[PDB]
Design goal:
part of a larger assembly; 2 chains; A: about 50 residues; 1 helix; B: about 100 residues; alpha+beta; three-stranded antiparallel β-sheet; about 20% strand; globular; Archaeal/vacuolar-type H+-ATPase subunit I (chain B); membrane protein, hydrolase
């Protein structure tokens, strides 16, 4: 039992959260962009 | 005279409680501003230290951290516990008669 266990474990718990929030937003991001580009293909196709 | 009273009260408290807060701060350095871990400061005398440890250990299993560091006489002790294990931790101090 040293304070180092929980100390240097806490500063990893924070990295695990950060990647969580990142790759949540970087996933939805893809889908929103992919929704736009799909409906452009549906306009491009539809008028032609 | 008002300045003087504030200056004198501040000294009186600071003269008393600098050495414990130094000790306590040191023990869990950089982990008192974290949400992941909860800290609770409290004072124990040599006499009380074994009782407090037993009480906490049964209450809080072996996933609690009891640390102490001296100061010349008793020990200011810090128990460090997980967040949401706060009530349980407190309850254990309260049964011994020790408080925050």
């Amino acid at each position: 039992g040293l304070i180092k266990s929980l100390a240097e474990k806490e500063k990893q718990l924070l990295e695990r959260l950060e990647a969580a929030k990142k790759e949540a937003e970087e996933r939805v991001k893809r889908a929103e962009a992919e929704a736009k580009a799909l409906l452009e293909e549906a306009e491009a196709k539809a008028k032609a | 005279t008002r300045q003087k009273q504030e200056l004198e009260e501040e000294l009186a408290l600071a003269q008393a409680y600098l050495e414990p807060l130094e000790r306590l701060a040191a023990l869990a350095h950089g982990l008192d501003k974290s949400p992941f871990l909860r800290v609770i400061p409290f004072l124990l005398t040599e006499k009380e230290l074994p009782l407090v440890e037993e009480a906490l250990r049964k209450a809080l299993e072996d996933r609690y951290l009891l640390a102490h560091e001296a100061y010349a006489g008793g020990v200011p002790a810090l128990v460090v516990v997980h967040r949401k294990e706060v009530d349980q931790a407190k309850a254990a101090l309260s049964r011994a008669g020790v408080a925050e």
